[PDB]
Design a protein around this motif. Structure first.
Motif, PDB file in Angstrom:
ATOM      1  N   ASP A   1      36.276 -40.399 -93.243  1.00 43.21           N
ATOM      2  CA  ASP A   1      36.125 -40.293 -91.829  1.00 43.21           C
ATOM      3  C   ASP A   1      36.543 -41.657 -91.341  1.00 43.21           C
ATOM      4  OD1 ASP A   1      35.574 -39.291 -89.320  1.00 43.21           O
ATOM      5  OD2 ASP A   1      33.385 -39.064 -89.667  1.00 43.21           O
ATOM      6  N   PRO A   2      37.551 -41.812 -90.534  1.00 47.14           N
ATOM      7  CA  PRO A   2      37.716 -42.997 -89.714  1.00 47.14           C
ATOM      8  C   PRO A   2      36.623 -43.167 -88.681  1.00 47.14           C
ATOM      9  CG  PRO A   2      39.347 -41.286 -89.123  1.00 47.14           C
ATOM     10  CD  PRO A   2      38.667 -40.884 -90.427  1.00 47.14           C
ATOM     11  N   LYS A   3      35.788 -42.136 -88.411  1.00 48.72           N
ATOM     12  CA  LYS A   3      34.739 -42.301 -87.423  1.00 48.72           C
ATOM     13  C   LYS A   3      33.511 -42.970 -88.012  1.00 48.72           C
ATOM     14  CE  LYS A   3      36.149 -38.415 -84.348  1.00 48.72           C
ATOM     15  NZ  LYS A   3      37.361 -38.050 -85.105  1.00 48.72           N
ATOM     16  N   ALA A   4      33.258 -42.832 -89.337  1.00 47.85           N
ATOM     17  CA  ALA A   4      32.037 -43.265 -90.002  1.00 47.85           C
ATOM     18  C   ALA A   4      31.787 -44.764 -89.887  1.00 47.85           C
ATOM     19  CB  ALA A   4      32.076 -42.889 -91.499  1.00 47.85           C
ATOM     20  N   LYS A   5      32.852 -45.581 -90.014  1.00 47.18           N
ATOM     21  CA  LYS A   5      32.797 -47.017 -89.848  1.00 47.18           C
ATOM     22  C   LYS A   5      32.429 -47.447 -88.427  1.00 47.18           C
ATOM     23  CE  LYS A   5      37.268 -46.939 -90.983  1.00 47.18           C
ATOM     24  NZ  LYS A   5      38.546 -47.482 -91.480  1.00 47.18           N
ATOM     25  N   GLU A   6      32.853 -46.665 -87.401  1.00 51.16           N
ATOM     26  CA  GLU A   6      32.525 -46.871 -85.996  1.00 51.16           C
ATOM     27  C   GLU A   6      31.054 -46.608 -85.737  1.00 51.16           C
ATOM     28  OE1 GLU A   6      33.171 -48.575 -83.368  1.00 51.16           O
ATOM     29  OE2 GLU A   6      34.727 -47.458 -82.240  1.00 51.16           O
ATOM     30  N   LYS A   7      30.515 -45.512 -86.309  1.00 48.13           N
ATOM     31  CA  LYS A   7      29.196 -45.045 -86.299  1.00 48.13           C
ATOM     32  C   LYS A   7      28.213 -46.001 -86.946  1.00 48.13           C
ATOM     33  CE  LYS A   7      29.774 -40.842 -84.497  1.00 48.13           C
ATOM     34  NZ  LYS A   7      28.737 -40.194 -83.676  1.00 48.13           N
ATOM     35  N   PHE A   8      28.538 -46.529 -88.142  1.00 49.62           N
ATOM     36  CA  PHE A   8      27.847 -47.593 -88.880  1.00 49.62           C
ATOM     37  C   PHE A   8      27.772 -48.875 -88.078  1.00 49.62           C
ATOM     38  CE2 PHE A   8      27.683 -51.117 -92.013  1.00 49.62           C
ATOM     39  CZ  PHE A   8      26.663 -50.684 -92.871  1.00 49.62           C
ATOM     40  N   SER A   9      28.845 -49.193 -87.334  1.00 47.88           N
ATOM     41  CA  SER A   9      28.928 -50.372 -86.504  1.00 47.88           C
ATOM     42  C   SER A   9      27.945 -50.269 -85.374  1.00 47.88           C
ATOM     43  CB  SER A   9      30.370 -50.622 -85.976  1.00 47.88           C
ATOM     44  OG  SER A   9      30.477 -51.818 -85.204  1.00 47.88           O
ATOM     45  N   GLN A  10      27.709 -49.059 -84.783  1.00 46.88           N
ATOM     46  CA  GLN A  10      26.702 -48.875 -83.870  1.00 46.88           C
ATOM     47  C   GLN A  10      25.363 -49.053 -84.519  1.00 46.88           C
ATOM     48  OE1 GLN A  10      27.578 -47.062 -80.077  1.00 46.88           O
ATOM     49  NE2 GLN A  10      28.326 -49.032 -80.922  1.00 46.88           N
ATOM     50  N   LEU A  11      25.130 -48.522 -85.746  1.00 44.41           N
ATOM     51  CA  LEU A  11      23.900 -48.453 -86.359  1.00 44.41           C
ATOM     52  C   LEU A  11      23.271 -49.821 -86.556  1.00 44.41           C
ATOM     53  CD1 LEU A  11      24.510 -46.297 -89.606  1.00 44.41           C
ATOM     54  CD2 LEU A  11      23.628 -45.299 -87.532  1.00 44.41           C
ATOM     55  N   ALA A  12      24.058 -50.837 -86.995  1.00 47.88           N
ATOM     56  CA  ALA A  12      23.585 -52.208 -87.045  1.00 47.88           C
ATOM     57  C   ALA A  12      23.275 -52.770 -85.677  1.00 47.88           C
ATOM     58  CB  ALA A  12      24.646 -53.082 -87.747  1.00 47.88           C
ATOM     59  N   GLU A  13      24.145 -52.574 -84.666  1.00 55.42           N
ATOM     60  CA  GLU A  13      23.971 -53.113 -83.328  1.00 55.42           C
ATOM     61  C   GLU A  13      22.770 -52.484 -82.657  1.00 55.42           C
ATOM     62  OE1 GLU A  13      28.248 -54.397 -81.486  1.00 55.42           O
ATOM     63  OE2 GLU A  13      28.048 -52.208 -81.826  1.00 55.42           O
ATOM     64  N   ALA A  14      22.647 -51.150 -82.817  1.00 52.72           N
ATOM     65  CA  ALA A  14      21.583 -50.341 -82.325  1.00 52.72           C
ATOM     66  C   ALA A  14      20.253 -50.693 -82.899  1.00 52.72           C
ATOM     67  CB  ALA A  14      21.897 -48.883 -82.679  1.00 52.72           C
ATOM     68  N   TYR A  15      20.183 -50.813 -84.233  1.00 57.94           N
ATOM     69  CA  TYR A  15      18.971 -51.186 -84.952  1.00 57.94           C
ATOM     70  C   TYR A  15      18.453 -52.487 -84.564  1.00 57.94           C
ATOM     71  CZ  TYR A  15      16.539 -53.237 -89.046  1.00 57.94           C
ATOM     72  OH  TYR A  15      15.613 -53.900 -89.877  1.00 57.94           O
ATOM     73  N   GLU A  16      19.391 -53.403 -84.628  1.00 59.44           N
ATOM     74  CA  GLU A  16      19.120 -54.812 -84.498  1.00 59.44           C
ATOM     75  C   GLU A  16      18.481 -55.155 -83.163  1.00 59.44           C
ATOM     76  OE1 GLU A  16      21.886 -57.803 -87.043  1.00 59.44           O
ATOM     77  OE2 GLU A  16      23.102 -56.298 -85.946  1.00 59.44           O
ATOM     78  N   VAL A  17      18.968 -54.563 -82.044  1.00 66.63           N
ATOM     79  CA  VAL A  17      18.406 -54.655 -80.707  1.00 66.63           C
ATOM     80  C   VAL A  17      17.071 -53.948 -80.631  1.00 66.63           C
ATOM     81  CG1 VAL A  17      18.746 -53.969 -78.273  1.00 66.63           C
ATOM     82  CG2 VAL A  17      20.618 -55.006 -79.595  1.00 66.63           C
ATOM     83  N   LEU A  18      16.976 -52.715 -81.157  1.00 70.81           N
ATOM     84  CA  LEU A  18      15.829 -51.853 -80.947  1.00 70.81           C
ATOM     85  C   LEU A  18      14.686 -52.208 -81.854  1.00 70.81           C
ATOM     86  CD1 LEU A  18      16.985 -49.864 -78.834  1.00 70.81           C
ATOM     87  CD2 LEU A  18      16.822 -48.086 -80.611  1.00 70.81           C
ATOM     88  N   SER A  19      14.970 -53.169 -82.739  1.00 72.13           N
ATOM     89  CA  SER A  19      14.112 -53.654 -83.794  1.00 72.13           C
ATOM     90  C   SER A  19      13.187 -54.642 -83.163  1.00 72.13           C
ATOM     91  CB  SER A  19      14.851 -54.357 -84.973  1.00 72.13           C
ATOM     92  OG  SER A  19      13.959 -54.768 -86.010  1.00 72.13           O
ATOM     93  N   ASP A  20      13.445 -55.025 -81.888  1.00 74.13           N
ATOM     94  CA  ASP A  20      12.449 -55.841 -81.221  1.00 74.13           C
ATOM     95  C   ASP A  20      11.777 -55.090 -80.124  1.00 74.13           C
ATOM     96  OD1 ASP A  20      10.926 -58.189 -80.536  1.00 74.13           O
ATOM     97  OD2 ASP A  20      12.726 -59.295 -79.843  1.00 74.13           O
ATOM     98  N   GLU A  21      10.518 -55.467 -79.906  1.00 73.05           N
ATOM     99  CA  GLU A  21       9.744 -55.173 -78.732  1.00 73.05           C
ATOM    100  C   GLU A  21      10.424 -55.744 -77.498  1.00 73.05           C
ATOM    101  OE1 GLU A  21       5.700 -56.474 -80.988  1.00 73.05           O
ATOM    102  OE2 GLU A  21       5.324 -55.444 -79.050  1.00 73.05           O
TER     103      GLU A  21
END
Length: 73
Positions: free
Chosen positions: A42-62
């Motif tokens: 999937d060329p989309k999977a790497k895009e999706k993973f890129s969100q996952l770190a950015e998404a996690y990382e922000v939402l990982s704080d209060e």
């Protein structure tokens, strides 16, 4: 020109009322989905993973989850 946006919650499959521990749990689960060797077929999977770190990382704080929830309103 403004690009379309999806929220970090949705990326992670986590609720709107998620606690950062909940977010930690999804991050593992999903990161596997979208990591290589998958990422070849999937060329989309790497895009999706890129969100996952950015998404996690922000939402990982209060603080960070809350500021982005406020500013994405």
């Amino acid at each position: 020109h403004m690009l379309a946006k999806e929220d970090y919650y949705q990326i992670l499959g986590v609720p709107r009322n998620a606690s950062q521990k909940e977010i930690k749990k999804a991050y593992y689960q999903l990161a596997k989905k979208y990591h290589p060797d998958t990422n070849k077929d999937d060329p989309k999977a790497k895009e999706k993973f890129s969100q996952l770190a950015e998404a996690y990382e922000v939402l990982s704080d209060e603080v960070k989850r809350k500021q982005y929830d406020a500013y994405g309103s």
